[PDB]
Amino acid sequence: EKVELTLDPDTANPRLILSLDLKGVRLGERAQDLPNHPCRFDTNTRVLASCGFSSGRHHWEVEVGSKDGWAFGVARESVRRKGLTPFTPEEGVWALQLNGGQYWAVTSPERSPLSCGHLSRVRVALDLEVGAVSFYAVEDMRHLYTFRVNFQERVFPLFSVCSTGTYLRIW
């Protein structure tokens, strides 16, 4: 079922720029002086939605920038917030990424280069019963990639922007 997400400003890395409607995120030039919430990503340029899921099937849609430097998908609640944490499934993050002009599923120890054409808006489908996170290009709902995961805890929508000049935006 459809979920209306808002970004959680307590989690946001201080270099990120969130939109006032808490749907949009970009990377800024300099770090804002933000109160040090324990949930805040102090180093990785990440932000979670406020909503986490422990059961059921849920979907949302993400508008993506055409320029390099984003990743999104889901993170387990216990993802490390403090220090430079590897962006890997073992560290509790399951994401797609645009980097070096190439779409990737962020697998380890090697990322997986995807076949897809240019992406504009992507549906993310989280199933905690089946144990799946799936991505679709919204135009014709074409499957891009599925991670099979045995989720053991609450899972949050995850967004990351690591370059100026691109963005992610919840639809």
Residue numbers in the entry: 340 to 510
The study reports:
Tripartite motif (TRIM)7 is an E3 ubiquitin ligase that was first identified through its interaction with glycogenin-1 (GN1), the autoglucosyltransferase that initiates glycogen biosynthesis. Human TRIM7 is a 511-amino acid protein that displays the canonical TRIM/RBCC motif followed by a B30.2 C-terminal domain. The TRIM7/GNIP1–glycogenin interaction was shown to be mediated by the B30.2 domain, whereas the CC domain was involved in the protein self-association.
Malonate is in the same position in three of the four molecules (chain A from the 1.6 Å resolution structure and both chains in the 1.8 Å resolution structure) hydrogen-bonded to Thr384, Arg385 and Ser499. The most external carboxylate of malonate also forms a bidentate salt bridge with the guanidinium group of Arg487 from a symmetry-related protein molecule. In the fourth molecule, this carboxylate group does not interact with a symmetry-related molecule and consequently exhibits a different orientation. During the refinement process, additional electron densities connected to Cys378, Cys390, and Cys501 were observed in the Fobs-Fcalc map in both crystal forms. Only Cys455, whose side chain points into the core of the β-sandwich, appears not to be modified according to the electron density maps.
